[PDB]
Design a binder for this molecule. Structure first.
Ligand SMILES: *C(=O)/C=C/c1ccc(O)cc1
Length: 125
């Protein structure tokens, strides 16, 4: 288990060290996206929240294919503004309801420390 709190101020520094197995040790869902929204990493906690099988969604586009209910100004619009700006740090509640029981969550999106990739962190509320 990786001991990291959801919403921590320096979360991007702490998760910069994590391979897929380490990410699977977190208490919350974690997705790493490229600037187009393609999934680079998707952890076990996230799959428990959403029902998706992690290795099956890596490589898919989060907004176009996996999570169309997030293709909205309230989620994807924030993401793409942050990619365009090169800076992103926002936390909001959302409901995931595509081919699943509607599930209310808290989402924290934050630009990764290095390069140009973006974290999406999720926990139940
Ligand atoms: C709405 O379509 C939400 C879907 C969803 C959210 C998060 C995931 O990791 C997978 C699917």
């Amino acid at each position: 288990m990786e001991h990291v709190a959801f919403g921590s101020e320096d979360i991007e520094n702490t998760l910069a060290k994590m391979d897929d197995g380490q990410l699977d040790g977190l208490a919350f869902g974690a997705i790493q996206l490229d600037g187009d929204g393609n999934i680079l990493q998707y952890n076990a906690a996230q799959g428990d929240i959403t029902g998706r099988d992690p290795k099956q969604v890596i490589g898919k586009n989060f907004f176009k294919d996996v999570a169309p209910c997030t293709d909205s100004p309230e989620f994807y619009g924030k993401f793409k503004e942050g990619v365009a700006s090169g800076n992103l740090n926002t936390m909001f509640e959302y409901t995931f309801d595509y081919q699943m029981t509607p599930t209310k969550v808290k989402v924290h999106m934050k630009k990764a420390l290095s390069g140009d990739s973006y974290w999406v962190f999720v926990k139940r509320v």
